[PDB]
Amino acid sequence: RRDWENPGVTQLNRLAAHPPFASWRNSEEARTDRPSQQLRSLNGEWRFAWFPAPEAVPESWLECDLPEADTVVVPSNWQMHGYDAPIYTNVTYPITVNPPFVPTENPTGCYSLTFNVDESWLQEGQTRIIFDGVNSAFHLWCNGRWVGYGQDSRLPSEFDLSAFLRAGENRLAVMVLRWSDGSYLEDQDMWRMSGIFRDVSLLHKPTTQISDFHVATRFNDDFSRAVLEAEVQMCGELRDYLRVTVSLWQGETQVASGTAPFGGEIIDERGGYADRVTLRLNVENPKLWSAEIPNLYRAVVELHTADGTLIEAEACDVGFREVRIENGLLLLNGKPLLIRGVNRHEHHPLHGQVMDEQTMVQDILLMKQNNFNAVRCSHYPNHPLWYTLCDRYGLYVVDEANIETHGMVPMNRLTDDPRWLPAMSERVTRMVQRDRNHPSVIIWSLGNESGHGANHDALYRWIKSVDPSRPVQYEGGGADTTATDIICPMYARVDEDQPFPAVPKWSIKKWLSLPGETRPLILCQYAHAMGNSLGGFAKYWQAFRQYPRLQGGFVWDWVDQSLIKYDENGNPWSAYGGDFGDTPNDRQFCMNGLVFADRTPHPALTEAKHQQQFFQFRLSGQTIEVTSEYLFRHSDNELLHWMVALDGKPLASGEVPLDVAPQGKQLIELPELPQPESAGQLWLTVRVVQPNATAWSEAGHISAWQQWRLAENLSVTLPAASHAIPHLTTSEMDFCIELGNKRWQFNRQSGFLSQMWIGDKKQLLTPLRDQFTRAPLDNDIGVSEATRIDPNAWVERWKAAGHYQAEAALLQCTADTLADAVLITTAHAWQHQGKTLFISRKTYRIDGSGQMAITVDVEVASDTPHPARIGLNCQLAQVAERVNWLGLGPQENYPDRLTAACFDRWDLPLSDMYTPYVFPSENGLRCGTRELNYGPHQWRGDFQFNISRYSQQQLMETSHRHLLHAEEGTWLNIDGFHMGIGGDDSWSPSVSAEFQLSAGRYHYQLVWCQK
Amino acid sequence: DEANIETHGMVPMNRLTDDPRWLPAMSERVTRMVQRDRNHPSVIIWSLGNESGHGANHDALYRWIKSVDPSRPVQYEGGGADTTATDIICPMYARVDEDQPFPAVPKWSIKKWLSLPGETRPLILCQYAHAMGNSLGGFAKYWQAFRQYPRLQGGFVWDWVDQSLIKYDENGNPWSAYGGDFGDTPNDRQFCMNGLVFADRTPH
Amino acid sequence: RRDWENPGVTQLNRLAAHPPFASWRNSEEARTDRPSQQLRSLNGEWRFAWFPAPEAVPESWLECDLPEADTVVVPSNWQMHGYDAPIYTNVTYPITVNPPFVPTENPTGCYSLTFNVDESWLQEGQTRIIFDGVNSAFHLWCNGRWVGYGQDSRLPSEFDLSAFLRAGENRLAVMVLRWSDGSYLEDQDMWRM
Ligand SMILES: O=[N+]([O-])c1ccccc1O[C@@H]1O[C@H](CO)[C@H](O)[C@H](O)[C@H]1O
Ligand SMILES: O=[N+]([O-])c1ccccc1O[C@@H]1O[C@H](CO)[C@H](O)[C@H](O)[C@H]1O
Ligand SMILES: O=[N+]([O-])c1ccccc1O[C@@H]1O[C@H](CO)[C@H](O)[C@H](O)[C@H]1O
C-alpha cells in the first residue's frame, strides 16, 4: 500500500479526536484533577531498532523482539540517541520536492514494547492506546496483528485495542517513517527529527461513555452575568435511564449543577441528536479569566444512571472570558488587548523536541517574569500540558494547525490544490476538536508560511462556523487575506514600507489605514532575536501604545534551537545547522531566541521586559504620574521605590505604596529633594516592586522601572597647579614623555601611542589605534555566505569598501611642549584602492597631573558605507578581576537597544562583560559611559565600550563560541560612536537611519589616567 | 449544477454533514464538479447538494467555491433554505401565501420570507409544485407572485419526468411500474412519479 | 482493505479532475468540435457476471474471462438487464444505517473487456481510461494488475494506464460494488441501481 506517499490516506482505523479525557470513575477525583486509574502511561523503556527504509524491516519483528534492537527511553527523537542526524534546514525541504513521494531511503524507527494488561480492562469497556506525537507517520501492530496508521506529527492518534489485547503480557510494534506525504505539510524552520516524541498512554473507557464535550461561556453586557453551556455527546447504547450532570465549582464551592437525560432539540426535518444533550448553567458575577488574573472554575461532566450510579466522569478547567473583534479592536472581556507575546517552539537542547513539565514551567515563569502575556504555538499544536499551564498561570495563546509548506514554489502550490484539502483539513479540525475547551486559547491560526490558497478559505470558514468564540488568523499570502480576522504580518517594520510585489510588507502604521482596511493588526512574528539583536525594539512599543489598532505582536522567538554536542574530552558545546553533517543546512538561523537553549537569558530579554512594562510614568517637577496598563486588576501587589543619586552616589530614596486602578493613574509627590554640593548629574530612578510572591514570581520581584535626569551641575572648578611638569624626549623614531613613574611612547613613523609604562611595567600589548569596524553581528551578515554573497548585507558593503582591509597612512606626527604639558598631534588617512575612507586627527595632551587627554576628530568619506563604529582600541597587558563604570548597564546595551539599561555605577567580574552568543561577534558594549575603571587605569569622557579577552579579529574569525580562547591581556574597545545593531529582521539591512554613522564628521574626547 | 451529496435518511439530517470526518468525501463531490464544469456558460449557479441538513462541512465548501469561482452564486436549501451556506433563499415547496412554521426549519410563504427582518437575498424555489398524478393545482398563484415581486425570481418545478420503469406481462405486453413492483421493499410506491411528462416523454 | 467501508478512502490512484479534454492533434478539428482520434470510445459489448458479494468473486477472473459470464451492452445498469432488482425508496436508506459500513451481501458486478491498443499510443505519451459514471464504487485491474479505485457515482474517474498496457489486445477487469460508504452520500429520492 505505501500509505505514506498518499495524501488521500492520512490515517487508517484512527478514532475521532476529542478534548483531554481521563475516564475518572469518581467525580471528586475528576473535580480535583487527580491521577486517574483508567489512564496509564506507557512512557519509559522501549525496544528500538533503526532501518534505512521500511522495506528492510524484518517480518519477524512483528512477532518478536529483534535481538539487535536496543533499549531506549520513549518519548524521544531518535536523532537524539545518535541513530541518524537531525537536519537544520529553514525553507528548502529536507527531501526532494516531488509530492507526494518521499525518498526510497527513508529512515524507519522500529519501536516495540512488551507490557502487561489486566483482564479487568478487557473484561468490559474499551481500551485504547494514545500516541500524543509520532513524527512523521506510523503503522501499529498489537500482538502481531495490524491495527492502523496515522499522520500529523503534532496531534494525538488513538486506536481501539480492545479486540487485540489479551490478559497478561502483550507486545506493541510501531514502525515510524521519518518521511511521509505528511512531511510536505511540515516544513517549519526548525530541526528535522523523527520518532515517538510525545507521550504514549492507555485509556480505558466504558462501553457507554462520554465521547465529546464542548464548554461555552456567554455574557451580558457588562459581564456581571454569564451562562455556561455544555454540550455533551455519548457513544454506546442509549437508554432512557441515562443522565448527564454538569457541575461547576469554584474551588470547593459548588457554583451550579444541572442534570438532563439525552436528547437534544430539533435541528432539522429529521429531528435532533438523540445522543447529545446540552446543559445550561447560570452564573452571577463570575470571576473572569485573563492573563492578568487567571480565575478558573472546574467543570465536571458525569455520565450516570437515573438511580445515581456513576458510569464515568470527564472534566476541564473553565475560564469565563469573551474574545471578540469589534470596531477594529480585539477585545477580551470587552477591553482591548495589548499583546506582549512571543513565538515559542518546543525545543530542548538535550531532548530535542520532547517536552517535559519542568521545562514548560521554567519557560512560563521566565515569560511572565519578563512581562509577556501571550504565546503563539509556532507552528503546530503543542504537547497537551502546555495549554493546562497557560490556563492556570495565565497566558493568551494562539493555537496553530501543523500546516507549513514554505518550500513549495509558489508557496501556495499545495494549499490551493483541492486534492490537499482533506489532509489539511484534518490538521485544523483535529486541533480544534482537542483544544477548544481551553480558555488560554484565544485565537486559532491556520498554520504558517503556506501562501494563501482556497483550502485556507474553506478552513477559515469551517472554524468560524464551529467556534464563533475565537477569531481566526493566518499570515500567508500577504497577511491581510480573506482568511484572516487579524492583519498579522511577520517582520513588517514600524515606519518603513517594504513593498514587495504581490505580498508587500507595509509599515504597520500605514497598513492599518490602507483604503477600506478596518481590522486590528497584531504581528504574528516581529523583531528577530538572532545573535546580538533587538535593535529598534522600542520603536514597536511606542507605536503599539500610540495606535489603538496596533495591538502588539509575538516576538521571534523564545528560545534558541541549539543542540548539545560533546567534544573530545566529553565537554558539551552548543551546535547549530551543519554541525551534524546535515546538508544542505541553514547554519545559525536556528538560533533566534530571547533565551539560550538552556534558558539563560540573552541581554535582549531585558530590553523586552522593559518595553513590555505594565506601568507607564511621567515626571513633572517632583511629581510622578504612574499610569497602569492593566485592563482588569488594581496594582495590589505593588510598591514604588525611588532613589536619587549623583553620579552614582545615592542621595536619597524612599517607597510609596501603589494603588492604581486598571487603566487609571496615581500621582506621587516626592519629598523636597535637597540640593547638592558637587558637580555631576542627578538622576532619579523608580522601580515597581511586588512585595509578595505569586504563582510565577518571588517576593521582591521588580516588574518595571524608569529613570530621569534631574538637575545637572556642570564643573566650573579649575583643577589646581600641577605638582610637576612632564618632560618630552625626542628621538628619530619616537616621542617619549616622562612624568613621575609613568612614561608614554609615541612612535613617529606609525603615529600611535605604542607603549605606556607604570614604573617598569609595560601596559600595552598592541598600540592604541583607531578602529572603524566590528566583528560582524548576525544582523550585519544576514544571509550572505561565501558561496553566495549578498552584496547588500552590511558586512559585504563594509568588506567591499575595504573597511576591514584599510591601512592607516601617517599624514602627520608632531610634539610640542606647552607651559604645563606636552602636546602630541597626529593625523592619519585610511585608504583603500586608493580611496580615502577615513581621516583621523588627534591630540594627546599630557599634563603635570599625569592625565592624558585625547581628542579625536574624524572625517568619513560620504561615499563610503557608514562604518560600524568610530573609536580606538588596544590590547592592555593587564588582566584584572573586575570592571567598574559609571554609565549605562548593567547588561550589554547598544544604541538602538539601550532603553532598559540604567545610568548608575556598576561593577562586574570581567567575564560578565562578554556575551557568549553561540555564533560569536561584536558583543558586550555598554553605552552612555562617563567613567570606566579597569586595573589601575581610568578612562573618562562620554563613550561606549566593550572589554574582554577576545579580539574583534578572533570573534570575526570564529564561528562557535566553544572555540574561542582568551588572548593574552585584555582587548579594550572604546568608541566615540557605534552603529545600531538592528534586528527588525536578520536578512535585510535593518539598522534605522537614525542609528547609522552618517554625519560625515565625528568628534570625541577621553581622558586616560591612573587610578 | 449540483454536487452528488444527499444524506436525507440520516437522523438528524446533518449527522454526516456536520462531522469533520466526512468533510473529505464531501469535499471531492463538490471540488471535482467545479473542476469539471466551470467552463460551461449554461451553468449559472452551483449547488452544494440536496437534503443533507446544514452542517459545517457545507459552510466550508460554500466558501471554497466562492473562493475558486466568484463568477457564479452558490445555493443550498438544507437546514431551512436561508442558511449561511446559500446566496439565494431556495426553499422546497414553500407556498405562496401560506406559512408552514415547522420548528427549526420553517417553510414561510415565499412573499413573507423575502421580507423577514434583516433578509435581503433573492428567492428562487429549488423545488415547487409537485407534479405527481393529477396535480399542479394552484400553479398560477406562483406565477402571479413571481411577476409581482421583483425578488421572487421563480423556481424549478418538481419535476420533469416520471421515474416509472417498463415491465412486461405474461403476454409480453409492456406496462409502467413503480416502487415495490420489482419485489423491492421497503419502497415508496408511486412517489417516484412526479413529472410533467410520462417516462416516455408523452406530456401529462 | 475494504476501501468501500471507509470514507477516508474515496479513490486510489485516480487522476485529477479537469474540464472535458480530447487532445486534438489538429487545431481546425478542435475549432469545429469534430471527433478526435485521441479520444476513443470503449462503449459496446462487454463481459459481465453478477456475484452476491465481493468475497465470492473468483481470482481467476482477474486474468481470465469467466466462462459463465454473459455479453451485455455498456453503459448500462445491471438491474435493467434483470440480474437483481432496482429499489425505489425515497428517504429511508436502502441499507441499514451504520456508517460507514454496508451490508455483507453486497451485489457485485464484474465487468470486463478485451480491447486493442495501437503501439502508436504507447511509444509516446500517456494513455488514460475514463469512466464517466460507475455506481457506486469500484476496483480496476488491467491485464490482471490492479490499477486503482474510485467512488462518487456521478463524476468521471480517470486512471493512467500507460504502464499497464501493451500493443495489441488488452483486458480490463472492473469490480463494481452496489453499496459503499459513498452510498451514505447518495440518498436521492429515485431508483437505487
Ligand atoms: O523564507 N525565506 O525564504 C527566507 C530567506 C532568507 C531569510 C529568511 C527567510 O524566511 C524567514 O526565516 C526566518 C529565520 O529564523 C523565520 O523562519 C521566518 O518565519 C521566515 O519568514
Ligand atoms: O533560509 N535561510 O535561513 C538562509 C540562510 C542563509 C542563506 C540563505 C538562506 O535561505 C535562502 O534565502 C534565499 C534568500 O536569500 C532564498 O529565499 C532561498 O530559497 C532560501 O533557501
Ligand atoms: O422528506 N421526507 O421525509 C418526506 C416524507 C414524506 C413525503 C415527502 C417527503 O420528502 C419529499 O419527498 C418528495 C417526493 O417526490 C421529494 O423527494 C422531496 O425532495 C422531499 O422533500
Ligand SMILES: [Mg+2]
Ligand atoms: Mg498518506
Ligand SMILES: [Mg+2]
Ligand atoms: Mg518557514
Ligand SMILES: [Mg+2]
Ligand atoms: Mg546552507
Ligand SMILES: [Mg+2]
Ligand atoms: Mg528610559
Ligand SMILES: [Mg+2]
Ligand atoms: Mg412503503
Ligand SMILES: [Mg+2]
Ligand atoms: Mg471508501
Ligand SMILES: [Mg+2]
Ligand atoms: Mg498480446
Ligand SMILES: [Mg+2]
Ligand atoms: Mg431526498
Ligand code: NA
Ligand atoms: Na495599540
Ligand code: NA
Ligand atoms: Na530560524
Ligand code: NA
Ligand atoms: Na499596591
Ligand code: NA
Ligand atoms: Na563570528
Ligand code: NA
Ligand atoms: Na419577480
Ligand code: NA
Ligand atoms: Na419523488
